[PDB]
Amino acid sequence: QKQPISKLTRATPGSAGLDLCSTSHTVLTPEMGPQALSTGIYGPLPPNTFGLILGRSSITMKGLQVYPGVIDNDYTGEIKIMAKAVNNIVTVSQGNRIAQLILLPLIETDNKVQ
Amino acid sequence: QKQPISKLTRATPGSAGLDLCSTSHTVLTPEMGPQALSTGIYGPLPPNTFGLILGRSSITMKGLQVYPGVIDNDYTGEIKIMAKAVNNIVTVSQGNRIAQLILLPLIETDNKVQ
Amino acid sequence: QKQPISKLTRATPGSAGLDLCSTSHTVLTPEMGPQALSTGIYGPLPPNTFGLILGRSSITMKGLQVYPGVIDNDYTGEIKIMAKAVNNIVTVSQGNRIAQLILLPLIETDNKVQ
């Protein structure tokens, strides 16, 4: 914070996503329902793209669900991870990769703004 | 209904998604499991694209989960939102934006139809 | 197994996704939490693309949730479906289409690997 998305890194050159970590240690329980985890990373995104925030497989399998997040091209706020403990108590340590940011083309349409 | 996707609007010019609302007031509880909410909006989609239906962040955080929906290019039926109340009772009012339609390129492959 | 993604088929020419089935009969219950279902299909993906694994609508509505899976371009391991029974006991029969693989462009950025 405030760090732009150009600071994020990829696990490998073939990686679809840029890695995202929480900036805090947090405990999640099933009865808590959706929590927004802070990353300290901020939009905006490169021209003509939007972002999709998704979980990592290994973290999903440990029972932390990441709800899909959509980041608009011109969003300048903080990117947060919407997360929920599925079945059991989950502990998120500062610095553990929890989610990934995937960049996709923004297709132009004639739909009206309103 | 029957309204085509060209009638949908974007929240802002930088918005990735086109907004979707339910046409009914509905109450959802956790024990109900997935429900298909009617939008009154119908495919098909623009040439060489498919649709992805996702939740909005603010609605996700109020404990209404939208399951990712895939809309094929040539689907002409009604777009519905697959939704579930996570932890608590959720009330959906007619007209409240619940989900978004994101348009993505349809990549061509040589995979067989069958 | 080991079958490449070129062996998968589409339901119809307009289908966004390539169909994925589990190679085993498996029962899932809500208390089990995320399970990785084997498909016997392996990466890698076509050049300049990544994969997104998502649920099918009809299966989502029968109470089997597929968590979004991201397949990197150069992944050569087995594609697995991360799945959970939502509310009730779900039975997956060998050969029933449970998920779909969607191919998307891999956008190039200057982000560092690390």
UniProtKB/Swiss-Prot annotation, chains A, B, C:
Gene that encodes it: gag-pro
Shown chain mapped onto the complete sequence: 631 to 744 of 911
Subunit structure: Homotrimer.
The name this protein goes by in its record: Nucleocapsid protein-dUTPase
Source taxon at top rank: Viruses
Subcellular location: Virion
